[PDB]
Amino acid sequence: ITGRPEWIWLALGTALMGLGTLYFLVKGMGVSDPDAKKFYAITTLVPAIAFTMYLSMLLGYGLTMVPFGGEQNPIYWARYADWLFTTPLLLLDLALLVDADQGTILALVGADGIMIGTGLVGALTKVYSYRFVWWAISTAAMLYILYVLFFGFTSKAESMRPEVASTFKVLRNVTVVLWSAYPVVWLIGSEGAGIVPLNIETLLFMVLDVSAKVGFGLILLRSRAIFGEAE
Amino acid sequence: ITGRPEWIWLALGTALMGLGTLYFLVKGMGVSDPDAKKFYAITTLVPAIAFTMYLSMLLGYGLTMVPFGGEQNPIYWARYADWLFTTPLLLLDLALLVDADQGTILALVGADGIMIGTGLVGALTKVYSYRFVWWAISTAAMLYILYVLFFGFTSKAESMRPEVASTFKVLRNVTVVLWSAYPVVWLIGSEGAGIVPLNIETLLFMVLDVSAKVGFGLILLRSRAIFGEAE
Amino acid sequence: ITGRPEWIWLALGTALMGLGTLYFLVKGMGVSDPDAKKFYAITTLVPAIAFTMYLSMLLGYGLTMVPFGGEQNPIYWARYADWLFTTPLLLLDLALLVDADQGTILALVGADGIMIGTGLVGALTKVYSYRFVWWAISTAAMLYILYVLFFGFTSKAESMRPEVASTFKVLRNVTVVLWSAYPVVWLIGSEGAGIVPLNIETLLFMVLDVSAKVGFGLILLRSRAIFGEAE
Ligand SMILES: CC(C)CCC[C@@H](C)CCC[C@@H](C)CCC[C@@H](C)CCOC[C@@H](CO)OCC[C@H](C)CCC[C@H](C)CCC[C@H](C)CCCC(C)C
Ligand SMILES: CC(C)CCC[C@@H](C)CCC[C@@H](C)CCC[C@@H](C)CCOC[C@@H](CO)OCC[C@H](C)CCC[C@H](C)CCC[C@H](C)CCCC(C)C
Ligand SMILES: CC(C)CCC[C@@H](C)CCC[C@@H](C)CCC[C@@H](C)CCOC[C@@H](CO)OCC[C@H](C)CCC[C@H](C)CCC[C@H](C)CCCC(C)C
Ligand SMILES: *C/C=C(C)/C=C/C=C(C)/C=C/C1=C(C)CCCC1(C)C
Ligand SMILES: *C/C=C(C)/C=C/C=C(C)/C=C/C1=C(C)CCCC1(C)C
Ligand SMILES: *C/C=C(C)/C=C/C=C(C)/C=C/C1=C(C)CCCC1(C)C
Ligand SMILES: CCCCCCCCCCCCCCC
Ligand SMILES: CCCCCCCCCCCCCCC
Ligand SMILES: CCCCCCCCCCCCCCC
Ligand SMILES: CCCCCCCCCCCCCC
Ligand SMILES: CCCCCCCCCCCCCC
Ligand SMILES: CCCCCCCCCCCCCC
Ligand SMILES: CCCCCCCCCCCCC
Ligand SMILES: CCCCCCCCCCCCC
Ligand SMILES: CCCCCCCCCCCCC
Ligand SMILES: CCCCCCCCCCC
Ligand SMILES: CCCCCCCCCCC
Ligand SMILES: CCCCCCCCCCC
Ligand SMILES: CCCCCCCCCCC
Ligand SMILES: CCCCCCCCCC
Ligand SMILES: CCCCCCCCCC
Ligand SMILES: CCCCCCCCCC
Ligand SMILES: CCCCCCCCC
Ligand SMILES: CCCCCCCCC
Ligand SMILES: CCCCCCCCC
Ligand SMILES: CCCCCCCC
Ligand SMILES: CCCCCCCC
Ligand SMILES: CCCCCCCC
Numbered sequence: 001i002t003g004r005p006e007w008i009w010l011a012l013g014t015a016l017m018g019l020g021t022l023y024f025l026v027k028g029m030g031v032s033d034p035d036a037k038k039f040y041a042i043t044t045l046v047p048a049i050a051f052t053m054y055l056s057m058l059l060g061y062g063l064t065m066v067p068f069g070g071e072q073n074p075i076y077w078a079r080y081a082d083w084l085f086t087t088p089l090l091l092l093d094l095a096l097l098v099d100a101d102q103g104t105i106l107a108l109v110g111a112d113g114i115m116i117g118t119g120l121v122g123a124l125t126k127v128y129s130y131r132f133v134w135w136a137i138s139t140a141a142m143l144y145i146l147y148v149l150f151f152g153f154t155s156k157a158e159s160m161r162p163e164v165a166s167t168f169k170v171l172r173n174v175t176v177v178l179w180s181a182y183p184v185v186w187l188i189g190s191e192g193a194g195i196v197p198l199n200i201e202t203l204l205f206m207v208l209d210v211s212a213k214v215g216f217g218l219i220l221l222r223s224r225a226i227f228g229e230a231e
Numbered sequence: 232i233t234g235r236p237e238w239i240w241l242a243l244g245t246a247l248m249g250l251g252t253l254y255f256l257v258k259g260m261g262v263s264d265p266d267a268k269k270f271y272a273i274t275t276l277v278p279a280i281a282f283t284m285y286l287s288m289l290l291g292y293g294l295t296m297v298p299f300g301g302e303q304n305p306i307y308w309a310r311y312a313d314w315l316f317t318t319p320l321l322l323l324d325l326a327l328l329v330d331a332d333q334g335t336i337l338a339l340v341g342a343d344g345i346m347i348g349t350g351l352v353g354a355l356t357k358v359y360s361y362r363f364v365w366w367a368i369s370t371a372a373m374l375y376i377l378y379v380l381f382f383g384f385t386s387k388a389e390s391m392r393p394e395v396a397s398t399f400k401v402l403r404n405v406t407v408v409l410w411s412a413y414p415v416v417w418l419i420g421s422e423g424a425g426i427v428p429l430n431i432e433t434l435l436f437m438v439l440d441v442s443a444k445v446g447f448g449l450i451l452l453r454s455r456a457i458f459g460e461a462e
Numbered sequence: 463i464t465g466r467p468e469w470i471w472l473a474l475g476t477a478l479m480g481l482g483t484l485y486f487l488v489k490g491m492g493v494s495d496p497d498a499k500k501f502y503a504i505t506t507l508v509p510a511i512a513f514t515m516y517l518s519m520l521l522g523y524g525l526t527m528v529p530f531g532g533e534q535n536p537i538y539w540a541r542y543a544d545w546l547f548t549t550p551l552l553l554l555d556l557a558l559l560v561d562a563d564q565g566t567i568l569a570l571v572g573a574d575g576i577m578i579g580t581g582l583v584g585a586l587t588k589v590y591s592y593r594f595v596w597w598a599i600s601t602a603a604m605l606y607i608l609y610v611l612f613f614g615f616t617s618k619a620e621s622m623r624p625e626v627a628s629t630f631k632v633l634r635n636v637t638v639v640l641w642s643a644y645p646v647v648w649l650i651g652s653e654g655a656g657i658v659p660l661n662i663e664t665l666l667f668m669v670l671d672v673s674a675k676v677g678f679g680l681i682l683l684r685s686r687a688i689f690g691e692a693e
């Protein structure tokens with residue numbers, strides 16, 4: 001395990017996701033409100049899935065070698081397995097907060113699936129120049145998602161409770177900033193142009209992942225917006 | 232890319248799915264009705280997914296070699312990845328049109344999953360005679376789906392709005408004819424008996440795919456059946 | 463096929479799932495009640511999926527070799543493909559019976575996904591001692607599911623119809639006993655410590671699978687709890 005310099009960040013990531021999972025699990029024990037239960041379920045599952053995939057990367061299972069540029073390049077494929085399930089759960093948290101219509105939710109989840117799926121294909125593609133074609137398609141799917149979060153959701157939040165409108169606005173802003181960093185790190189890291197070494201890349205993704213999951217969850221689950229308006 | 236004679240049909244397929252995706256995306260921009268949004272979301276996602284998988288076939292990612300009959304046989308596995316997601320979306324379009332009950336929808340999607348999954352296993356099976364066992368099981372799942380579309384849905388459409396009944400009937404008929412061709416092409420093509428060469432097989436699937444997705448979508452999204460009855 | 467001593471149990475399993483599938487399919491033909499249709503759909507799909515995966519194991523497709531302990535160890539990976547889809551369907555049968563809230567259903571299905579997914583990783587892991595780390599995480603996800611079935615569902619059933627409360631209690635008890643055997647068989651069988659040989663392991667899983675699917679389904683589909691209260 002320690003044979004890879006990036007192991008320290010995989011281990012820290014595993015620990016922080018594990019701790020985040022346990023914290024949300026305990027916190028949600030005292031919850032009976034049916035609406036709050038939905039948000040706790042979604043939000044606890046996110047770091048639990050990430051915990052398993054960080055562990056698989058730490059132990060070496062979630063790593064494969066991909067030939068491109070005349071080299072055997074270490075590619076952590078387990079990231080995409082994580083993201084396939086956790087990024088639509090994160091979007092679902094946002095969509096339920098603002099009572100999004102079903103068509104909009106399906107558009108978001110579908111675009112998200114395309115985003116992660118094409119990122120996976122790009123990560124595993126052996127023809128170097130083609131990796132960036134997949135990156136571009138994935139990034140276009142991301143831009144669609146960000147567009148919807150701003151010009152379909154923000155003006156939906158404003159007709160809702162003030163506490164859900166303010167909580168949505170904060171989580172929207174956190175999401176757009178954090179999620180936009182992922183394609184940049186991929187592009188300059190070992191999957192793309194290879195300018196930033198894998199150990200630093202792994203650190204960067206770990207900070208983004210913990211912030212986008214445990215950070216996000218801490219903000220959401222401390223808000224009164226997750227509860228039905230009750231006396 | 233041009234090293235494979237079937238590349239021209241993969242390229243045309245990619246282009247037509249891409250163009251179809253953009254057309255539906257633009258067309259649905261001016262839509263606020265919650266019901267119509269569902270149909271636009273579902274129907275736009277279908278060629279978008281197909282676009283990505285056609286591209287993966289064009290670039291060579293979605294192709295593998297399978298030993299059977301003492302030969303290395305080129306198998307485009309990306310078709311099944313496409314179909315796994317797009318065929319239940321197509322069925323969902325039909326089921327929502329007639330306000331199908333939840334049990335019926337689950338039966339359809341489940342049978343569809345079995346249909347595509349067993350087709351994939353058959354496509355990748357190395358014992359030649361066993362490929363046709365999987366083809367038979369998949370075809371039985373197809374026949375179940377077609378049965379339900381006729382003797383569970385058609386008489387559901389007739390108690391609904393005339394515009395939804397007439398639109399459903401047309402899309403049902405398009406679906407049954409087009410979908411029934413797929414097992415025949417598989418059986419006589421490079422996956423099955425090998426009587427029709429891969430380049431012609433690829434052409435045939437491209438015509439079926441564009442018709443079943445973009446053709447289907449053009450009929451559906453031009454109907455007033457996708458809108459709630461409103462003043 | 464007969465080259466593997468466990469083939470007889472794979473063949474019997476295939477037959478019993480096939481027969482169970484046909485029986486439930488015929489039985490549900492005379493059903494119009496929308497609630498009952500849901501239970502028939504879910505419950506018929508379960509042995510149908512299991513039939514396909516038992517067949518893939520019989521024909522040899524669903525088997526791979528995994529190096530650990532200095533040996534090539536036969537691992538039937540198709541079990542996890544089965545279980546990935548059938549165990550959440552089984553939980554859905556239980557959850558719908560007691561009209562579980564959406565948050566609880568998502569927690570169950572999510573924990574179940576983690577349970578099966580980590581079992582799959584453990585089954586395919588090449589470092590022997592690490593296989594048991596994945597077994598432990600999977601078992602913890604199982605224990606969560608069993609906890610919810612007892613201390614979240616049982617007291618939900620009691621405020622419902624007596625026929626649904628009594629049917630739920632029986633199916634809950636069947637589920638907890640049968641499902642708890644699976645991690646034990648894995649641990650002592652060819653995936654784990656290797657004390658029980660593969661042919662006996664295969665027998666054990668076949669008895670558990672038929673009981674947990676066809677047995678379970680026979681109890682559920684003969685109950686009046688699956689019908690809406692109607693005059
Ligand atoms: C509604 C939304 C969910 C829409 C989803 C959007 C989605 C369509 C976007 C594209 C997804 C698609 C790229 C998934 C591809 C998975 C694939 C990378 C798995 C690895 O297999 C690739 C090659 C080795 O590189 O296998 C070597 C050759 C092997 C023989 C491969 C044969 C097995 C195939 C992988 C079977 C395909 C199954 C499905 C792709 C399962 C989807 C997995 C998940 C990653 C989407
Ligand atoms: C409700 C509905 C959805 C019901 C669904 C119906 C469904 C049950 C029908 C059968 C689906 C099942 C056949 C999927 C099999 C996928 C498999 C072909 C992927 C390729 O792996 C096959 C061999 C190489 O040929 O791998 C070589 C050996 C490797 C070590 C394989 C180990 C990895 C396994 C593939 C893990 C299994 C994961 C699940 C099958 C994911 C499902 C993928 C999708 C195609 C259904
Ligand atoms: C809401 C709930 C559903 C939550 C779900 C919980 C879930 C997160 C729990 C963990 C699931 C995760 C372990 C699935 C891993 C599948 C993996 C074993 C498939 C086989 O690939 C493993 C190695 C060979 O051993 O591939 C060799 C290297 C290859 C290059 C691998 C590259 C292809 C990757 C497999 C692509 C990943 C796609 C997704 C994992 C699809 C999920 C399949 C299913 C088994 C969950
Ligand atoms: C918890 C993990 C999260 C929130 C991950 C988010 C990841 C993305 C938004 C990834 C986006 C990518 C692209 C837009 C193109 C390049 C490849 C990706 C997959 C890194
Ligand atoms: C957009 C793509 C569509 C509508 C594809 C439909 C495909 C089928 C109905 C495929 C059916 C098959 C069988 C019935 C058995 C042989 C294998 C298949 C998968 C080709
Ligand atoms: C129809 C099949 C059923 C009901 C299978 C149930 C399987 C399980 C509950 C498996 C549990 C496992 C663990 C808890 C850890 C070890 C690995 C598994 C996957 C066997
Ligand atoms: C969105 C953030 C992307 C920028 C990442 C900056 C990383 C700077 C680290 C120094 C680069 C290491 C190069 C020498 C090894
Ligand atoms: C459902 C349509 C299946 C029939 C396809 C007919 C294809 C005819 C093309 C000629 C066959 C090529 C054989 C000589 C290369
Ligand atoms: C939950 C049941 C697990 C116990 C399984 C008992 C199997 C006993 C069979 C005898 C073991 C075979 C060892 C000699 C080959
Ligand atoms: C490819 C995996 C996509 C599914 C991820 C799980 C999250 C799905 C959330 C469903 C949202 C509800 C839509 C109506
Ligand atoms: C194996 C992939 C199956 C899922 C495909 C996505 C479409 C699912 C549509 C869900 C229909 C709603 C059922 C209640
Ligand atoms: C990884 C596969 C998980 C999906 C299995 C299919 C069963 C899903 C049942 C959905 C229950 C409804 C939740 C709201
Ligand atoms: C186009 C929608 C406006 C809100 C999205 C902001 C786009 C940020 C760009 C992210 C950088 C990705 C490379
Ligand atoms: C049995 C249901 C009647 C409607 C379905 C028509 C079946 C068409 C056969 C398709 C050919 C597949 C090989
Ligand atoms: C902790 C919840 C109480 C009900 C679950 C009973 C646990 C049975 C243990 C199963 C054995 C697995 C190794
Ligand atoms: C070796 C790099 C070749 C450049 C490929 C860039 C493709 C980016 C596509 C953006 C439309
Ligand atoms: C080499 C071909 C052997 C014939 C197999 C046909 C099987 C079809 C099954 C239909 C019930
Ligand atoms: C070779 C076996 C080494 C023992 C591993 C047991 C790990 C079990 C983890 C339970 C917390
Ligand atoms: C990680 C295993 C958890 C089993 C005990 C249940 C914890 C309490 C959860 C309350 C919903
Ligand atoms: C509760 C702490 C969980 C941390 C387990 C994984 C950390 C890796 C240590 C090497
Ligand atoms: C908008 C046109 C999209 C076409 C891109 C793929 C066509 C392949 C050209 C070689
Ligand atoms: C209807 C009987 C189904 C049995 C088919 C599979 C049994 C395997 C026989 C070798
Ligand atoms: C993006 C950083 C999130 C910070 C989380 C802090 C949570 C405290 C309530
Ligand atoms: C099956 C062929 C479909 C033809 C689509 C034409 C759409 C015009 C409205
Ligand atoms: C766990 C054993 C189940 C027994 C099923 C018998 C069904 C008869 C109604
Ligand atoms: C990591 C366990 C958290 C302890 C409880 C925190 C207050 C709910
Ligand atoms: C008003 C919300 C500001 C949140 C910005 C957080 C940036 C990481
Ligand atoms: C809305 C601001 C987006 C900031 C992008 C930051 C990418 C590192």
Ligand SMILES: CCCCCCCC
Binds near residue numbers: 250253254257
């Ligand atoms: C391909 C872009 C379509 C242009 C608009 C067509 C009329 C909505």
Ligand SMILES: CCCCCCCC
Binds near residue numbers: 401404
């Ligand atoms: C009355 C509907 C006829 C549609 C037939 C289309 C055949 C491709």
Ligand SMILES: CCCCCCCC
Binds near residue numbers: 412
């Ligand atoms: C309902 C008519 C079906 C026609 C099947 C055509 C197969 C090529």
Ligand SMILES: CCCCCCCC
Binds near residue numbers: 484489
């Ligand atoms: C296996 C076929 C079952 C025959 C009908 C049983 C009574 C519904």
Ligand SMILES: CCCCCCCC
Binds near residue numbers: 631632635636639
């Ligand atoms: C009162 C229900 C008892 C069911 C026990 C079944 C054990 C297999």
Ligand SMILES: CCCCCCCC
Binds near residue numbers: 638639642643646
């Ligand atoms: C509730 C009793 C569980 C029995 C476990 C049996 C495991 C073989």
